[PDB]
């Protein structure tokens, strides 16, 4: 059979396959954006059809996060190797594992069908009210997808937590990363469901939470209470993969295993109580802003320890071993890229600096370096490491120095200018812009078209 299969390793493959398929739509949406931003004036989107652009950015953000990266890093690799890293045979809850991947597909079909049938309007991937609750039915459809996706995420989190009961070996660092990510989902998802229901209530049940005398900022607190743990849920599995790749490909025992494990735990605890650095410009109390700013900076301490522990893993490795394997290059590239993304995150953590850089392309570049480069490269690196175990072929990616170099150069061309544009300044979620920002936007656009061409070379 193909749909009835409960084998966890098969389901892991399905997660990877589905993420690539949905990735194409996400890439298409991303390509539409940079083509439009090539220069001032409409290029592929009519001025009378600006609503479509708002939908493109809204779906680009939603699909890439919930439908592409999260299934790939939290559903794909973990379902394949996690029961193997544990001494157990298969996943604890086989039937739940089957329904989780099916749920992800159905939610994807609902989302894309809504593009085709409903009027195309957008409110951003964060769905801030009141804009989200004064829109058309496409917003209702997107909410159903998120709620449905939430069901799959929570049941998958329950599945991984049960490994603690049955694990017959040692809890490796990678296993810890998945377990702690599951803990974050369990504590953050129910809060997300509650606020999403309130959005539906206003949209569909004549609720008045998001009109005058009802604080709209209420949504931002509850949403970001899940929002920031989500970004840490995306990256923590990537950290686990990097730890395995560096140790395995260098024949070096992981240094400071317990320090690595405690760093992951510390990040989750801190990541659950710093959500309001997304709300600096709303006008919070003085003491509130100081607290979140102070605690946000503290997240760098555990994150820094992991970076240094990774570096010493690569240092001193035997020279005779060939170092040009794509998996090793991607793992090393992650350290270089993540540091850039994290440092810029610390810059925008300072709230007064953030006043100028909120809702600008500097924030875009910040999370693209971490997610579009780092997370993707970590997912690529893990899949490459498991090529023999997974057994896929008909691609030239294992030893391809051209692909690694071209990818690194061109992605940096896309997003380095966006840091510069942030100070110029160019707002986010914008289709037109002043003529004097064209040069930097043009350079990034040339970077985007180049990256897409490179992907065709792997086949």
């Amino acid at each position: 059979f193909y749909i009835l299969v409960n084998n966890n390793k098969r389901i892991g493959i399905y997660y990877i396959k589905l993420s690539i398929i949905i990735g194409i739509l996400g890439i298409v949406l991303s390509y539409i954006i940079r083509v439009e931003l090539y220069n001032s004036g409409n290029r592929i989107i009519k001025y009378d059809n600006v609503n479509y652009y708002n939908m493109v950015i809204t779906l680009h953000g939603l699909l890439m996060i919930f439908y592409i990266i999260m299934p790939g890093l939290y559903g794909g690799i973990p379902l394949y190797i996690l029961p193997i890293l544990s001494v157990i045979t298969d996943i604890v809850l086989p039937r739940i594992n089957n329904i989780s991947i099916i749920i992800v597909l159905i939610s994807y079909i609902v989302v894309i069908n809504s593009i085709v049938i409903e009027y195309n309007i957008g409110t951003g991937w964060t769905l801030y009210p009141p804009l989200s609750i004064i829109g058309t039915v496409i917003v209702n459809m997107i909410l159903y997808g998120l709620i449905i996706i939430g069901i799959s995420s929570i049941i998958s989190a329950i599945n991984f937590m049960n490994i603690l009961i049955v694990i017959d070996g040692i809890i490796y660092v990678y296993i810890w990363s998945i377990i702690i990510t599951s803990v974050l989902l369990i504590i953050s998802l129910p809060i997300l469901n509650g606020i999403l229901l309130m959005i539906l209530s206003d949209i569909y049940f004549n609720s008045i939470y998001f009109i005058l005398n009802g604080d709209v900022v209420l949504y931002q607190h509850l949403f970001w209470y899940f929002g920031h743990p989500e970004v840490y849920i995306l990256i923590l599995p990537a950290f686990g993969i990097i730890s395995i790749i560096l140790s395995v490909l260098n024949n070096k025992i992981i240094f400071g295993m317990k320090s690595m494990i405690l760093a992951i735990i510390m990040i989750s605890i801190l990541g659950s109580i710093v959500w309001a650095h997304h709300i600096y410009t709303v006008g919070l109390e003085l003491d509130t802003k100081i607290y979140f700013n102070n605690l946000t900076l503290i997240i760098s301490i555990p994150t820094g320890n992991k970076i240094y522990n990774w570096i010493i893993l690569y240092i001193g490795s035997y020279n005779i071993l060939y170092n040009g394997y794509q998996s090793l290059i991607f793992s090393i590239m992650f350290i270089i890229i993540f540091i850039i993304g994290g440092i810029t995150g610390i810059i925008i953590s300072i709230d007064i600096i953030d006043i100028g850089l909120h809702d600008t392309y500097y924030i875009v570049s910040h999370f693209h370096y971490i997610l579009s480069i780092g997370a993707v490269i970590s997912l690529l690196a893990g899949i490459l490491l498991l090529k023999d175990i997974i057994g896929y072929y008909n691609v030239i990616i294992k030893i391809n120095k051209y692909f690694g170099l071209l990818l690194f150069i061109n992605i940096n061309i896309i997003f380095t200018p966006q840091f510069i544009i942030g100070f110029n300044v160019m707002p986010r979620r914008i289709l037109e812009y002043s003529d004097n920002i064209i040069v930097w936007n043009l350079i990034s656009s040339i970077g985007s078209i180049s990256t897409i061409l490179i992907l065709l070379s792997i086949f």
């Binding site: 006008g283 919070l284 109390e285 003085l286």
Partner: protein, 100 residues
């Protein structure tokens, strides 16, 4: 004619002599929504005692305009004129203490 006369009498007086500065009761917060509601309630009570024509209540309205946007005031003034403004309901006709 005293240095601390502003504070003496009322905390209200502080912004009556300095309309464009922060009110002591709401200076700690950037959000001034509660400040606008207090100012409007003060204007409503002035008219009840002194009447609209009184210059004092005219200035109280000006104080409200200093912190209340016009789109809010137009809506709230409409409710006040009809008689459905919850701020201006006479105390003996309030329902806050009823049924709990």
């Amino acid at each position: 004619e005293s240095a601390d006369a502003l504070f003496v009498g009322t905390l209200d007086r502080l912004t009556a002599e300095h309309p464009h500065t922060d009110d002591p009761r709401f200076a700690f917060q950037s959000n001034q929504w509660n400040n606008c509601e207090l100012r409007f309630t003060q204007f409503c009570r002035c008219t009840r005692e002194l009447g609209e024509d009184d210059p004092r209540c005219k200035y109280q309205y000006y104080r409200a305009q200093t912190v209340c946007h016009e789109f809010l005031l137009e809506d709230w003034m409409e409710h006040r004129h009809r008689g459905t403004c919850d701020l201006d309901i006479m105390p003996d006709r309030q329902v806050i203490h009823m049924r709990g």
